[PDB]
Ligand binder design. Sequence first.
Ligand code: SF4
Ligand code: SF4
Ligand code: FES
Ligand code: FES
Ligand SMILES: [Fe+3]
Ligand SMILES: [Fe+3]
Lengths: 633, 633
Amino acid sequence: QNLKSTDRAVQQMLDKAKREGIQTVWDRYEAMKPQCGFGETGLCCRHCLQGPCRINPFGDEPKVGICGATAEVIVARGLDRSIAAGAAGHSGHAKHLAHTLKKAVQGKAASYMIKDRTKLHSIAKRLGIPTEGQKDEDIALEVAKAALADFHEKDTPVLWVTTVLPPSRVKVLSAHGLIPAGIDHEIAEIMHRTSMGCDADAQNLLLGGLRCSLADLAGCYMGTDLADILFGTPAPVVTESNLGVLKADAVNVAVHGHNPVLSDIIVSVSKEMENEARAAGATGINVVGICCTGNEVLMRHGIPACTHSVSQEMAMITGALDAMILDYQCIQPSVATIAECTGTTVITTMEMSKITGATHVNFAEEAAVENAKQILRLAIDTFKRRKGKPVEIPNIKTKVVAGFSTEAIINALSKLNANDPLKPLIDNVVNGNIRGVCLFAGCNNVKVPQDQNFTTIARKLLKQNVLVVATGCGAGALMRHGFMDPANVDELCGDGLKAVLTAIGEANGLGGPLPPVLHMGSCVDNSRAVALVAALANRLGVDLDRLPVVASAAEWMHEKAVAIGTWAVTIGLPTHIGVLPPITGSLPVTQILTSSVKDITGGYFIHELDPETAADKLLAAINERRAGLGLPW
Amino acid sequence: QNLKSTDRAVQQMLDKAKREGIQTVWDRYEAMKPQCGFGETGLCCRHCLQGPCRINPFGDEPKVGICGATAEVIVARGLDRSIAAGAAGHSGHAKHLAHTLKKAVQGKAASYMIKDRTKLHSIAKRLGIPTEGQKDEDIALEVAKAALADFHEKDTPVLWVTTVLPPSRVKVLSAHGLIPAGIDHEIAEIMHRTSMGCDADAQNLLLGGLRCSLADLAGCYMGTDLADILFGTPAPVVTESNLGVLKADAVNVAVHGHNPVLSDIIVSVSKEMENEARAAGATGINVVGICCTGNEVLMRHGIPACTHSVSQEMAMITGALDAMILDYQCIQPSVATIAECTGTTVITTMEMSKITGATHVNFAEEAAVENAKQILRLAIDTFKRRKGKPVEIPNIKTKVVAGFSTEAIINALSKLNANDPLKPLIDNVVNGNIRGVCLFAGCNNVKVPQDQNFTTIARKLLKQNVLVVATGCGAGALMRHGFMDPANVDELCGDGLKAVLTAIGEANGLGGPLPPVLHMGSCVDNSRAVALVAALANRLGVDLDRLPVVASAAEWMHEKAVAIGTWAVTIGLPTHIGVLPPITGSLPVTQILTSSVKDITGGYFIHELDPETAADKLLAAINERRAGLGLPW
Ligand code: SF4
Ligand code: SF4
Ligand code: FES
Ligand code: FES
Ligand SMILES: [Fe+3]
Ligand SMILES: [Fe+3]
C-alpha cells in the first residue's frame, strides 16, 4: 500500500477498503494497465468522424492522420484543448463568483456581502475604477462588471492579465501576440483552431495555447480577487490535517470541490445548527475540507483538511463521513457508488455538475442559508443512522499553519521593514540565506505514489535554503506530511532559510519560526504567488524571467493544472512537471515546450519523472537565475 | 476507384495520383485500418493525465475510468466536446463577420459596405432594434453590436436563438433549460462540465450538449444574416460544377474554406486584374470554389464549384490549379504537401489557421483589396511557371441552378400567391403533391464512398415526391451528380413533385421547372432552412416537431456537422445520420439520442448506415408526421 500512497492514514484505509471489497482509484488504475501508448504519447486524434486516427511513434504506417494532420499538429491540437478546458474550469469558477458579488450588492442575496473593503478598493484602483466619493456597493458593482467584461472581446484586453503582471512582461507578451482578448473568446478560438481542417502549424498552434493559458491565469486571479472581497483575505491560521480530523462522535461534513460560494456558507450555518446536531446525539457539526474548496475554508477559517485529490475516497472508507457536499471539479464520480457501501450522503449542488446516484440540492445564492440547512439536516439524519456503529478513523493528523495570502506575507515581512516590506526578503536572496523560491502546485496523480514527488523534491530544496510556497493539492501533500508545522523547521530547513523563517516569525509575535512551507491557498490562489513574484520583480526592476523563482507541478493530473503549468512558463518561470503530458510523440513540440519557448517568454518546462533528479534540475534553474543577476550561488 | 468516389472526375484524378505516386486521403485512410475500436465506440477518455482510459465494450476489465467515470459519462462527455468545437467554428465565423460589419460602418474598411439594406432592416426589426429615422450605418452598428453581445451573458438570452424560432418552440426549450445564455459562454461551460471530476450524469451532460448545439444554431444564423447584409442575399443563379470548370488556359484560383469576407473580395478584384492576367499569357482569372466558401460565392455570384470536402486534393492533381486561397475549416492540411508535387500555390490568410509549408498572407479587412491583389499576383506568377505544360482536367461538369435563399424561395412562391406565398407550398403538402421536406446537410467522409449516401437517398425521396433542399457538401454532392439541373426533373422527380416544381418555375419566367434539388447555400446557411421551416410552422400554427420535415447528414465528418445534427434534433426534426458517431459504446446514451430525446424536443437521431434503409426510415418519419396532421400518406 506504500506503493500506492506515502500517506499512512491513506494506507490504513486502503487496507480497510481491500478487506471490505470496495474498489478504489488505485484498483481502477490497475485494471487499466497497460494504458494505450498512442494516447500516452499524444499520437491520437478524434476531432472528426473519419477518425479515430493514430500515428505510430516509430516504425511504419500509420504515419499521418487521414486528413493529413502530422504528429506535431495532432500533439499540439490535443494539448491546446487541454489548456482551453482548464481555462474553462478556472474561469467558470471566477464567473460564478462575479455573479455572486453582483447579486450581493444588488440586494438579491443577503447571505453575501463585501467582507474585505480594503481589497475591494485596491482591486478597483488596479483596474482604474474610481473610488473617491463612491458607495462601496457601486464600486463593487463596477468591479463585478469589469470581471464579467473580461470574458468577451471589448475595447481593452483582459485586464486580469494586463493589470496584474509587470509592464515589461506585458510588453514581451504583446509583442508575440499572446495577450488574451477575452476569456471565453480565447477558449472558443482554441476549440475552433484545433477542429479539423483549421490550424495546422505546431508553432502557431502552441502560441495560441500560451495565450489561452493567460486566459486561465486571468480566471485564477479573478477568482482569488472576488473570493477575498466576498469572504475575506486569508491571514495566518492554525489547524490540522489528514483523516484523524474526523470525529467519531460528531456529524462529519466534508466540503469538496473548488468554489466556496457554497462551502463558506456551510461553515457559517453549521455553527448555528450545532444544538440541532446535539439533539441527534452528536457533539455538533465537524466541517472538514477535501481538495480546493477545503483549502478555501482552511485558509479563511481554519477548517481542518481531511484529505485531497487521489485519496478522496479514503475519507468515506472510515465509515464516519456523514455527508460530502460537492460543487465541481476533481470529484471522483466513484464517490456516488462508494457511498452505497459506506453510508455517506453525497450531495451535489451545481446544475452543471451532477453525479448519477447522488442526491442533488439546487443551491442558489438567493437561498444559501436555507439550502445549507437542508443539506446539513440530511447529514444529521445520516449520523443518526450510524449511531453506535463502529468506525475506523486512523488516529493520524498533522499540525498545519496556513493562511499565507500575499497580503499576509507582505504584512509579516513589514515587521522587519515597515516602509519597504519586500526588501528583507530580497536582502536574504542576495546574501544567500534564501537561495530562491519554489511554488509547488497542482494535483496528485494515481501514476505517482501519492505525495512522493512533492515531499522528495521539497526536502532537498528546503535543505538548500529555497523558500517553498504551495497551493492546491501540492499544499495538501506537504501539509499532510508535516511541512506546515513550524516544529519541523529544525529538521527540514537549511540554516540560512531557518534563520529567515525564525526572524520573521519572531517579529510577528510567535516566539517561533514561520512553517517550513508557506501555504498560499487553493488552485486559483496560484494567482497569489503571481502577485508576490510580480511584486518582487517590480521592486527589483526586472522581469519575472530574471528572478530565482521556479515552479513544480510535481504530480499533476487535471486539465486545470496543464493550463497553470503553461501560464507559469508563459509568464517566464522554469516549470518542472512530474508526469509526462501527451507530447512525447512529437519531438518538435517537446523541443518547443522544453527549450525554444525560452526565446519567447523566458520560461520553459522541465520534464523530469525522477524527483531526486527534478530537485537537482530545479536547483540548477534557480542557480542559473542567480548567476544572471550576478549573485553567488 | 469507384469504391473511393462515385464522382467520375474524382475517379480520373485518383488514377493520375496513383500513377504519379501522390498519396491521397483515401490512401491515408487505408494506412489507418483497422481503426481503434475504443475510439470508434466512444469508450476512450483523455481528459486528464491519469489517462488514457478506455472501457471494453464487452467482456472483462477495464470496465470504468480510473476516476470512476462510467461508459455513459465518458461517451456523453466526448460528444459534448464535439458539439462545443462545432459551435466554436460556426460562431468564430459569425464573430469575424460581425467585426467586419462594425469596421465597415465605422469607416475603417471601405472594401466592405451594406449591400442588402432590406435585409439589414428586417434583421433589426426582428431583434427589436429601432430603424425609424435612423441612418443605415447606425442601424448596422446596432445590429453588429447585438451580434457580438450574443457571445456572452447579458440580460437577454441569445437572440439569434429566441427571435428565430417559433414562440412555442422557444417555450418548449426554455422549460427544459435549453436556451443558451451566451455563445462562447455555453462553449466554455461544456469544456468545464466535461473536464475531469465535474458533470457525471449522462442525461445532465446531454441536456448541456443540446443547449450548446443551439449556440451553434445561433452562430449559423448570425453568419448567414451578416454575410447577406455585407455581400447580398442570394437569388437564383446558373453556373457549373466539378473539375471540368477549370480551364487550362486561365489562371485557375480556388477559394477554399468557409468565411467569404476574403473570397468575396477575391471575386471582385480578380475581374479588375484580368488584363494583368492576359499579359502573362492567360485568358484571365478563373475563380472557382471548393467547400463552403465556394458555395458562398456560387450562391451570390455564380462562381462555378470545382469540388468539395473529401475530394479537395483532386483539384490540385489536375496540374492546372495555380493557387488555392484558404481561410479556415475543412482544409485537408495535406494540400500544403501535395502542392510541392502539383505546383499549386497554397496561401493561408487567417492568423489562427496556418499550414506548415504554405505561404501566408496576412489578410486584413482594412487592406482587403491590396491583399487580394498580392494574392492574385502570386497566382499569376504560378500560371507563368506552367506555361506550355500539359494538364489533365477531366472534361466532366454539370449544370447547377442555385441561389435558393429563403427569401428567394418565398419570392418564387409569391408568383403563385402574392399575399400568402407559403400557402401554395402547404396546399401541395396537404394534397400529396409534396410528401414532405428533406434537408441534406453536412460533409463527405472517407468511410463512405463519396456521394453514395446523398445520391441514393435523394433519388428515392424525389421519386416519392419529397421536396429536397441541400446545403454545404450535401449540396456539393447533389450538384456534382446533376441534381441541380432542371433538365433532370423528368428522370428524377415523382409526378406530384414535378408538377409543383414546373408550376413554380414557369410562373418565375423560365419555361421550365425549378431544379430537382434546391441549393440553400453553405453550412451556416442551414440557418436558411430553419427560417423556411419556422415560417411554415408559424403559417400552420404548429411547432416544428409536427411538420413533415426531416434532415439527413448522410456522410457527415466535422465537429461542425455534429453540432448541426444535434440542433436539428433539438429544434424538433427527425435527423438521419449516415456515419456512426462515437456513441455505440453506451446503450443508455444511444437510447437517449435515438429515442427518448423525442419526449424532450420531439426530434430524434435516425442512425442508419445503409442508404436504401435510411431513405425508407426518412419516408416513414415524414409519413408519421403526415399522419399526426391527419393527412393522407
Ligand atoms: S481531424 Fe484529421 S487526424 Fe483528426 S480524426 Fe479527423 S481525419 Fe483524423
Ligand atoms: S477524466 Fe477519468 S476517465 Fe478521463 S482520463 Fe482522467 S481518470 Fe481517465
Ligand atoms: S488509440 Fe488509444 S488514445 Fe486513441
Ligand atoms: S484507445 Fe484508441 S481512441 Fe483512445
Ligand atoms: Fe484536489
Ligand atoms: Fe467542405
